Amino acid sequence: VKKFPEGFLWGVATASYQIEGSPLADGAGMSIWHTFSHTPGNVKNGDTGDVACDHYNRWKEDIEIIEKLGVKAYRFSISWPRILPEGTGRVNQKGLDFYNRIIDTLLEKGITPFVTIYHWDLPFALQLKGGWANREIADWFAEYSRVLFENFGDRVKNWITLNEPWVVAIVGHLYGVHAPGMRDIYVAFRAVHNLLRAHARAVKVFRETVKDGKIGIVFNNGYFEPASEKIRAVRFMHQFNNYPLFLNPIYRGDYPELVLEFAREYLPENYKDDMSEIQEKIDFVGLNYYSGHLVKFDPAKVSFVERDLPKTAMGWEIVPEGIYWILKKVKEEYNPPEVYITENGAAFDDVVSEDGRVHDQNRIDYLKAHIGQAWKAIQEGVPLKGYFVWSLLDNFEWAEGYSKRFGIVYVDYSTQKRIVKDSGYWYSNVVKNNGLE
Ligand SMILES: O=C(O)Cc1c[n+]2c([nH]1)[C@H](O)[C@@H](O)[C@H](O)[C@H]2CO
């Protein structure tokens, strides 16, 4: 058997825009994902988050699913423009009420809330003022975070400032594939820097407002392996695409060496002036992990090399040892006091069989392998306190729309029916047993 530490936090994760629907209900302002998805050409099939999983109405049912599965923690995000419709200034009580009911329900049912303050749904009003490109967002984000802390910090004790600031900056402002859909490398690196400044300011406010409780930050990570033994390209991909881009500032007070080699000219001229503030002490690091990649130098002087490995419906290579590597590596490089796996999961072409069940053995095999590697990292000293499956529900998968299903629960979008998949049932047994057998 593979048993986890006593009180290890087994969880599931979601994000507001991906599951809620009703983006403009009850006085909410538009987000940048509302306007981006309503722009033709940006999202597969013209899909939007207008309805999604209708969690805005079905939240109680969904939480009852978490309870019934015996899952111990729920990672969810708060929609900034539901709380402050113009981004700063006015606070919307109906937006607070929505999350208040979720928080109280979770606590009543003995489920630990983990709140992501920002999972990509920036208020549109702030994007008109440059969004993450504007230095003033450190102030706007701090004011937003302070409202959440004042309203919920009595009950919610586990907070995450940002989900995947690399994705927000680079996919949103360089690749242009995510909101706000820009392609400018100078803007993208100023977003990187302002995301760090905003994170640190929010942590600073947290220490002033919520006497009890812990705050951290979540990074996307890939497992990069070299295509040959000629290695530096892997080095750069790790430092740029993984936690070091942000953790080197936080722990060491500067960007990683190979990031500066690539991107110095794109960063603000006096960016180091902000570094002492960026070193604000954090309580844990959240790592998201899904895929491994074979990488070679290619005259960012990096290209991916396709491997003949099992892949998910995203085309992502399944490399379970990657989750072990990233956990070992984070300890070795920055030694954070606590780590969580804040997302791990897979998209497959799920079908409801004639027997009414969703037989996703492929997803079971994926989760089991990665949970096994996480267990290993714990045996070797990594202070992993929890593990969150992405996602509770099939949902709006950003620019892929509804075409990619990551849930351990199937959603029939025609009826909003939830069908617990085989992977959901399997996971519930893992949680009940506190591990694998
Ligand atoms: O970017 C990565 O490699 C890691 C990643 C996967 N995912 C995420 N990050 C986001 O946090 C989620 O909102 C997505 O739904 C999910 C699946 O794509």
XYZ file of C-alpha atoms and ligand atoms in Angstrom:
455
model
C 0.000 0.000 0.000
C 0.929 3.688 -0.322
C -0.461 5.565 2.668
C -0.166 9.359 2.960
C 0.604 11.406 6.145
C -2.109 11.856 8.774
C -4.365 14.821 7.874
C -3.092 15.026 4.250
C -5.544 17.220 2.334
C -7.190 15.433 -0.598
C -8.975 17.915 -2.805
C -10.631 18.835 -6.090
C -10.229 22.156 -7.946
C -12.303 24.506 -10.164
C -12.207 28.159 -11.348
C -15.063 30.711 -11.407
C -15.305 31.517 -15.147
C -14.930 27.869 -16.104
C -17.924 26.577 -14.058
C -20.224 29.409 -12.858
C -22.067 30.827 -15.882
C -24.278 33.882 -15.301
C -21.269 36.263 -15.667
C -23.465 39.401 -15.482
C -25.906 38.177 -12.828
C -26.631 40.192 -9.681
C -24.684 43.369 -10.519
C -21.410 41.679 -11.651
C -19.135 43.664 -14.033
C -17.815 42.106 -17.272
C -14.501 40.251 -17.047
C -11.835 40.091 -19.800
C -12.917 36.459 -20.423
C -16.460 37.588 -21.093
C -15.291 40.119 -23.724
C -12.526 37.824 -25.132
C -14.911 34.834 -25.567
C -17.627 37.050 -27.094
C -15.087 38.155 -29.716
C -15.444 35.881 -32.822
C -12.400 33.719 -33.526
C -10.944 33.538 -29.996
C -12.600 30.348 -28.665
C -13.253 27.016 -30.396
C -16.848 26.728 -31.680
C -17.620 30.241 -30.477
C -18.081 28.810 -26.961
C -18.350 31.223 -23.993
C -18.666 31.101 -20.186
C -22.262 32.447 -20.333
C -23.720 29.172 -19.000
C -20.796 26.728 -18.426
C -21.858 24.261 -15.658
C -24.452 26.718 -14.241
C -22.657 26.397 -10.877
C -23.926 29.920 -10.111
C -27.299 28.184 -9.603
C -26.215 24.595 -8.869
C -23.488 25.283 -6.289
C -25.271 23.409 -3.422
C -25.675 20.223 -5.520
C -21.990 20.381 -6.571
C -20.781 20.754 -2.971
C -23.082 17.827 -1.973
C -21.147 15.844 -4.609
C -17.821 16.789 -2.947
C -19.273 15.742 0.469
C -20.701 12.461 -0.842
C -17.276 11.635 -2.374
C -15.672 12.394 1.003
C -13.216 14.829 -0.569
C -11.613 16.877 2.199
C -10.707 20.173 0.501
C -12.156 22.296 -2.296
C -10.022 24.742 -4.289
C -12.203 27.351 -5.986
C -11.697 30.867 -7.273
C -13.490 34.137 -6.733
C -14.611 36.286 -9.693
C -13.068 39.755 -9.048
C -15.766 41.612 -11.077
C -18.569 39.938 -9.048
C -16.980 41.490 -5.951
C -15.859 44.854 -7.381
C -17.734 45.405 -10.698
C -15.396 48.288 -11.734
C -12.330 46.522 -10.297
C -11.799 49.096 -7.507
C -14.168 51.234 -5.431
C -17.711 49.870 -5.199
C -18.230 46.501 -3.479
C -21.130 44.283 -4.618
C -22.872 42.592 -1.656
C -24.635 40.057 -3.880
C -21.208 38.897 -5.138
C -19.984 38.484 -1.564
C -23.258 36.648 -0.649
C -22.676 34.076 -3.464
C -19.247 33.052 -2.080
C -20.360 33.462 1.549
C -22.986 30.680 0.990
C -20.354 28.419 -0.603
C -17.846 28.984 2.247
C -20.471 28.396 4.985
C -21.772 25.269 3.271
C -18.243 23.795 2.916
C -17.453 24.469 6.623
C -20.805 22.982 7.725
C -19.876 19.817 5.752
C -16.286 19.667 7.095
C -14.621 20.537 3.727
C -11.583 22.877 3.798
C -11.898 25.858 1.426
C -8.797 26.852 -0.530
C -9.526 30.183 -2.214
C -7.758 31.314 -5.397
C -8.046 35.098 -5.443
C -7.211 35.386 -9.152
C -7.838 32.709 -11.742
C -7.797 34.917 -14.865
C -11.179 36.768 -14.883
C -9.804 40.316 -14.567
C -12.519 43.021 -14.426
C -12.907 44.496 -17.916
C -12.907 48.007 -16.368
C -9.290 47.448 -15.234
C -8.218 46.093 -18.655
C -9.344 49.452 -20.169
C -6.687 50.972 -17.880
C -4.012 48.525 -19.135
C -4.745 45.578 -16.770
C -1.551 43.667 -15.762
C 0.527 46.041 -17.945
C -0.198 48.957 -15.531
C 1.990 49.268 -12.373
C -1.084 50.552 -10.549
C -2.582 47.026 -10.600
C -0.434 46.224 -7.486
C -2.716 48.775 -5.700
C -5.926 47.541 -7.379
C -5.112 43.892 -6.561
C -4.212 44.776 -2.946
C -7.561 46.607 -2.480
C -9.444 43.590 -3.954
C -7.554 41.091 -1.774
C -8.198 43.273 1.333
C -11.954 43.117 0.686
C -11.827 39.290 0.466
C -9.717 39.050 3.638
C -12.063 41.372 5.590
C -15.160 39.521 4.432
C -14.008 35.867 4.460
C -10.745 35.673 6.476
C -12.688 34.774 9.644
C -13.645 31.461 7.960
C -11.274 30.870 5.024
C -7.733 30.184 6.265
C -5.979 28.976 3.134
C -5.462 31.535 0.308
C -3.752 31.612 -3.105
C -2.935 35.058 -4.644
C -2.468 34.039 -8.321
C -3.132 31.021 -10.521
C -0.249 30.548 -12.992
C 1.082 34.064 -13.465
C 3.307 32.727 -16.345
C 0.145 31.805 -18.282
C -1.585 35.127 -17.445
C 1.442 37.089 -18.681
C 2.737 34.986 -21.563
C -0.342 33.226 -22.966
C -2.482 36.365 -22.408
C -0.071 39.095 -23.593
C 2.578 37.410 -25.819
C 0.831 34.445 -27.516
C -2.539 36.234 -27.488
C -4.366 32.899 -27.090
C -5.931 33.915 -23.752
C -7.563 37.133 -22.570
C -6.784 39.944 -23.037
C -5.451 38.476 -26.337
C -2.331 40.626 -26.908
C 0.985 39.899 -28.720
C 3.663 42.229 -27.383
C 6.761 40.835 -25.585
C 7.460 44.105 -23.681
C 3.877 44.134 -22.333
C 4.142 40.413 -21.402
C 7.278 40.964 -19.278
C 5.864 44.008 -17.614
C 2.840 41.783 -16.747
C 5.240 39.195 -15.223
C 6.771 41.930 -13.051
C 3.450 43.509 -12.046
C 1.966 40.079 -11.190
C 4.872 39.632 -8.726
C 4.370 43.140 -7.272
C 0.601 42.607 -6.920
C 1.128 39.171 -5.284
C 3.564 40.641 -2.709
C 1.252 43.575 -1.887
C -1.687 41.178 -1.322
C 0.489 39.035 1.011
C 1.502 42.240 2.913
C -2.190 43.176 3.345
C -3.006 39.570 4.450
C -0.509 39.847 7.395
C -2.263 43.065 8.450
C -5.811 41.673 8.128
C -5.961 37.914 8.805
C -4.050 37.073 11.998
C -4.684 33.345 11.362
C -4.314 31.584 8.062
C -1.807 30.884 5.356
C -1.187 32.432 1.928
C 0.694 31.148 -1.129
C 0.806 31.227 -4.910
C 0.330 28.661 -7.688
C 2.655 27.948 -10.703
C 2.231 25.815 -13.878
C 5.077 23.354 -14.449
C 6.188 20.968 -17.149
C 8.790 18.204 -16.931
C 11.327 19.085 -19.590
C 13.803 16.422 -20.731
C 16.629 16.985 -23.276
C 16.341 15.426 -26.740
C 20.034 14.398 -26.650
C 23.082 14.747 -24.409
C 24.584 17.816 -26.106
C 20.501 20.373 -21.696
C 20.714 24.185 -21.518
C 17.447 24.466 -23.455
C 15.894 22.357 -20.671
C 17.576 24.684 -18.168
C 15.948 27.727 -19.816
C 12.498 26.052 -20.059
C 12.614 25.156 -16.370
C 13.659 28.686 -15.330
C 11.144 30.423 -17.673
C 8.074 28.155 -17.778
C 8.294 26.689 -14.275
C 8.207 28.057 -10.693
C 11.769 29.648 -10.842
C 10.543 32.671 -12.857
C 8.601 33.743 -9.762
C 10.367 31.890 -6.924
C 13.790 33.302 -7.742
C 12.404 36.851 -7.163
C 10.447 35.748 -4.052
C 13.279 33.787 -2.356
C 16.394 35.310 -3.949
C 15.398 38.803 -5.101
C 16.020 38.536 -8.860
C 14.848 36.712 -11.954
C 16.623 33.429 -12.929
C 19.879 33.790 -14.931
C 18.627 32.357 -18.244
C 15.405 34.434 -18.084
C 17.546 37.589 -17.802
C 19.678 36.401 -20.755
C 16.510 36.093 -22.867
C 14.333 38.897 -21.479
C 16.348 41.665 -19.808
C 15.524 44.162 -22.548
C 11.745 43.567 -22.026
C 11.721 44.128 -18.258
C 11.394 47.629 -16.823
C 14.762 49.420 -16.635
C 14.765 49.687 -12.845
C 12.860 46.462 -12.059
C 15.336 45.640 -9.195
C 13.930 48.598 -7.228
C 10.808 46.428 -6.656
C 12.598 43.229 -5.594
C 12.874 43.874 -1.827
C 9.087 44.183 -1.703
C 8.586 41.118 -3.907
C 10.389 39.056 -1.232
C 7.327 39.282 1.099
C 7.283 35.953 3.066
C 4.880 33.268 1.736
C 3.460 30.233 3.630
C 3.287 27.632 0.867
C 3.904 26.980 -2.810
C 1.241 25.470 -5.051
C 2.452 23.488 -8.042
C 0.291 22.516 -10.978
C 1.579 19.641 -13.115
C 0.087 17.818 -16.155
C 2.676 17.007 -18.830
C 6.283 16.327 -19.803
C 8.079 17.668 -22.886
C 11.115 16.717 -24.949
C 13.071 19.837 -25.740
C 15.941 20.798 -28.042
C 17.902 23.926 -28.863
C 16.622 25.355 -32.120
C 18.301 28.474 -33.667
C 13.446 31.605 -27.591
C 15.849 29.136 -29.326
C 13.777 26.176 -28.090
C 11.446 23.783 -29.872
C 9.452 20.799 -28.666
C 10.139 17.322 -30.011
C 7.119 15.028 -30.396
C 7.515 11.669 -28.603
C 5.706 8.383 -29.111
C 4.233 8.316 -25.601
C 0.614 7.971 -24.439
C -1.133 11.372 -24.766
C -4.368 12.884 -23.426
C -7.107 14.453 -25.616
C -5.056 17.694 -25.344
C -2.155 15.881 -27.041
C -0.159 16.254 -23.812
C 2.405 13.469 -23.153
C 1.683 11.463 -19.976
C 4.863 11.401 -17.913
C 4.049 10.579 -14.278
C 7.678 10.821 -13.039
C 7.451 14.547 -13.852
C 5.335 15.230 -10.748
C 8.036 13.531 -8.619
C 10.783 15.541 -10.342
C 9.110 18.934 -9.843
C 8.456 18.260 -6.148
C 12.069 17.161 -5.533
C 13.356 20.130 -7.554
C 11.259 22.754 -5.711
C 12.616 21.465 -2.343
C 16.172 21.434 -3.678
C 15.993 24.912 -5.206
C 13.906 26.996 -2.776
C 12.967 24.682 0.128
C 9.481 26.156 0.661
C 8.033 25.263 4.081
C 4.886 23.639 2.591
C 4.017 22.495 -0.945
C 0.640 21.506 -2.434
C -0.136 19.916 -5.745
C -2.920 22.401 -6.604
C -3.862 20.830 -9.968
C -3.227 17.430 -11.619
C -5.648 15.837 -14.089
C -6.290 14.850 -17.713
C -8.681 15.342 -20.604
C -10.064 12.255 -22.344
C -12.910 11.693 -24.828
C -15.455 10.713 -22.138
C -18.654 8.934 -23.123
C -21.696 7.880 -21.107
C -22.103 4.094 -21.801
C -25.513 2.369 -22.196
C -25.117 1.321 -18.523
C -25.332 5.029 -17.497
C -21.691 5.110 -16.321
C -18.546 6.877 -17.590
C -15.806 4.239 -17.776
C -12.727 6.496 -17.787
C -10.066 3.898 -16.920
C -7.583 6.074 -18.798
C -8.165 8.872 -16.257
C -7.904 6.445 -13.318
C -4.552 5.197 -14.720
C -3.327 8.797 -15.088
C -4.317 9.892 -11.559
C -3.033 6.665 -9.912
C 0.407 7.005 -11.513
C 0.814 10.655 -10.499
C -0.493 10.086 -6.953
C 2.121 7.241 -6.679
C 4.949 9.594 -7.700
C 3.698 12.254 -5.257
C 3.760 9.619 -2.474
C 7.407 8.895 -3.385
C 8.393 12.547 -3.064
C 6.848 12.559 0.431
C 8.861 9.459 1.460
C 11.994 11.388 0.367
C 11.268 14.455 2.508
C 9.178 16.834 0.373
C 6.690 18.673 2.672
C 3.660 17.982 0.422
C 0.543 18.751 2.471
C -2.133 18.042 -0.119
C -3.117 17.097 -3.637
C -5.965 18.588 -5.781
C -7.518 16.889 -8.821
C -8.298 19.176 -11.786
C -11.265 19.180 -11.983
C -14.408 18.305 -9.971
C -16.461 18.959 -13.148
C -16.083 19.002 -16.946
C -16.091 22.721 -17.697
C -15.188 25.614 -20.039
C -11.584 24.843 -21.021
C -10.560 28.388 -22.025
C -9.773 28.692 -25.783
C -10.805 24.998 -26.301
C -14.315 25.782 -25.023
C -16.392 22.759 -23.937
C -14.546 20.361 -26.263
C -12.161 19.169 -23.492
C -13.482 17.307 -20.431
C -11.225 17.270 -17.324
C -13.818 16.356 -14.670
C -14.042 13.384 -12.360
C -17.750 14.271 -12.763
C -19.324 14.329 -16.236
C -21.584 17.225 -17.135
C -24.289 16.775 -19.773
C -24.504 20.383 -20.973
C -27.957 19.858 -22.560
C -29.548 19.069 -19.167
C -26.855 20.130 -16.618
C -26.957 16.550 -15.298
C -23.901 15.482 -13.286
C -22.729 11.877 -13.667
C -19.913 10.798 -11.323
C -17.267 9.154 -13.552
C -15.412 5.919 -12.611
C -12.395 8.150 -11.806
C -14.571 10.082 -9.281
C -15.589 6.842 -7.570
C -11.994 5.611 -7.580
C -10.691 8.885 -6.136
C -13.242 8.814 -3.324
C -11.818 5.418 -2.305
C -8.280 6.838 -2.345
C -9.372 9.697 -0.056
C -11.275 7.355 2.342
C -8.174 5.115 2.540
C -5.774 8.108 2.714
C -3.832 6.627 -0.241
C -3.339 3.819 -2.812
C -3.475 0.011 -2.393
O -0.613 25.343 -18.093
C -0.370 24.207 -17.666
O 0.499 23.423 -18.101
C -1.144 23.725 -16.461
C -2.668 23.908 -16.462
C -3.667 23.111 -16.851
N -4.827 23.711 -16.530
C -4.496 24.930 -15.900
N -3.188 24.992 -15.883
C -5.487 25.975 -15.395
O -5.179 26.350 -14.048
C -6.925 25.453 -15.469
O -7.735 26.611 -15.427
C -7.112 24.644 -16.779
O -8.463 24.254 -16.908
C -6.247 23.348 -16.710
C -6.416 22.417 -17.905
O -5.843 23.011 -19.062
